[PDB]
Write a protein that binds this DNA or RNA. Structure first.
Length: 464
DNA sequence: TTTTTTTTTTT
């Protein structure tokens, strides 16, 4: 039988490729989300070349020390996660996971000699994200479920706010599992209150399932939901697919039909290209370019035209007319599509860890890495295999120097400290201080928080 | 199998 898999991370920072993980959580589930298997949780040892960015530690409450003690080396952290995720017929998911938690999962596998995509592709493996489903469910069919309004009075879509607003427990928040359960809790709330909707979002999660909606030459008007539209509009507005992104066929070029199209008609690409790369403030007394890219491969909420009903669009405030007129004009303008699609025809990182998306690895290397996966820590020095990619030869030096310091050789050991020297440069460390200071000054009142700010400096000493 | 500015989200 096919299964879901609700997972969650706790990291030492936002950026997946640079900031490292700290904790993991996961639960296997059936077609109706009921709890199969043993709840799995590990910790990840932070290597001797990285300092957690305070903000992460303050909100997680998880110090590196704790992780160094409780946790396994990143290789095992990967392996153990890879082994859960490689299970066939699985829909691996979480909250914001596609935007975040999964990326980490990629960079981990990338770092530790694995396929960072296969886990959500090979042997009938898919993925999903409830965050969009919440926004959608509020936007279109909010019957039954509660949604919390903020200070100003706009709907929140935090897990911590949605849980407390739906009876689900979230004492001990930002605790790997506590989320993973409270994450499942919502799926059963959406399959209950609007399975009508749920199955729609679900079945159309896959790439090939989305093309059904996207009619490009004729520009069929679809309903879309992203946080990018913002809470003020209920994260919703109709869109018309102009074209497939020139340099990235995983992206479709859409038009916000709720906005003011005229710029598209009354400017050239090189201005529009400036006007959409213009920020929300310095676009002064003008209109904003109502264009956006929807990425098909990222479980986007795409629905059929009439899905959004007059009962809903009135509740929200989106102006049916404007979107139609604008469509009429867009279909009556076969050159809007000309420049807009030109815009996206203008095309680099230095650190190997962030060098994930430099294409893919050739079948020659795919083997060569899988063979490095066979080699026991002993023989990594010994084995002679040729590599096409320059990224691997680098990755292998780090891989050993973090996960297996015992394997290091007299020279390597001193190259590693010379790396650590280039990493931990005086002023760079000073920053860390200024930050810790400023924060402890900010969070001076609290003792339990400061307790961490202390520990991070303690860590920042001994590690250096 | 893959990636500048919206907006909100997770750590």
């Amino acid at each position: 039988q096919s299964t879901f898999l609700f997972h969650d991370y706790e990291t030492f920072g936002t950026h997946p490729a640079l900031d490292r993980p700290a904790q993991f959580a996961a639960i296997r589930t059936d077609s109706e989300f009921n709890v199969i298997g043993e709840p799995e949780v590990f910790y990840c040892k932070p290597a001797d070349d990285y300092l957690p960015q305070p903000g992460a530690v303050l909100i997680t409450g998880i110090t590196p020390q704790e992780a160094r003690a409780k946790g396994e080396n990143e290789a095992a952290f990967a392996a153990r996660i890879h082994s859960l995720f490689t299970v066939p017929k699985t829909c691996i998911l979480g909250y914001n996971n596609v935007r975040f938690d999964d990326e980490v999962t990629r960079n981990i596998f990338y770092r530790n000699f694995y396929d960072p995509y296969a886990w959500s592709w090979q042997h009938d493996n898919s993925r999903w994200d409830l965050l969009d489903v919440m926004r959608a469910c509020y936007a279109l069919r909010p019957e039954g479920i509660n949604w919390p309004e903020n200070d100003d009075g706009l709907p929140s879509f935090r897990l911590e706010h949605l849980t407390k607003a739906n009876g689900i427990e979230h004492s001990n928040a930002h605790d790997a599992m506590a989320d993973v359960y409270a994450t499942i809790a919502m799926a059963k709330l959406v399959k209950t209150r609007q399975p009508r909707l749920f199955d729609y979002l679900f079945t159309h999660r896959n790439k090939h399932k989305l093309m059904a909606l996207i009619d490009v030459p004729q520009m069929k008007p679809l309903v879309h939901v992203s946080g990018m539209f913002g809470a003020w509009r209920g994260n919703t507005s109709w869109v018309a697919p102009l074209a497939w992104h020139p340099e990235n066929r995983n992206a479709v070029i859409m038009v916000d039909l709720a906005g003011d199209i005229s710029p598209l008609l009354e400017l050239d690409s090189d201005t529009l290209r400036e006007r959409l790369y213009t920020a929300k403030t310095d676009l002064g007394d003008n209109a904003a370019v109502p264009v956006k890219l929807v990425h098909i491969n990222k479980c986007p909420v795409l629905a059929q035209a009439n899905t959004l009903r007059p009962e809903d669009a009135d509740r929200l405030g989106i102006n049916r007319q404007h979107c139609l007129d604008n469509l009429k004009i867009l279909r009556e303008n076969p050159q809007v599509r000309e420049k807009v699609v030109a815009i996206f025809a203008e095309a680099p990182s230095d650190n190997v860890d962030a060098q994930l998306y430099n294409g893919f690895f050739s079948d020659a290397d795919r083997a060569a890495m899988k063979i490095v996966l066979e080699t026991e820590p002993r023989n990594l020095p010994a084995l002679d295999i040729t590599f096409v990619d320059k990224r691997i030869e680098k990755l292998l030096f780090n891989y050993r120097a973090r996960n297996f310091p015992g394997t290091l050789d007299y020279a390597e050991q001193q190259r590693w400290l010379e790396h650590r020297r280039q990493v931990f440069t005086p002023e760079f460390l000073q920053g860390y201080a200024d930050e810790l200071q400023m924060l402890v000054q900010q969070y001076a009142d609290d003792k339990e928080k400061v307790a961490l700010l202390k520990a991070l400096w303690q860590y920042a000493e001994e590690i250096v």
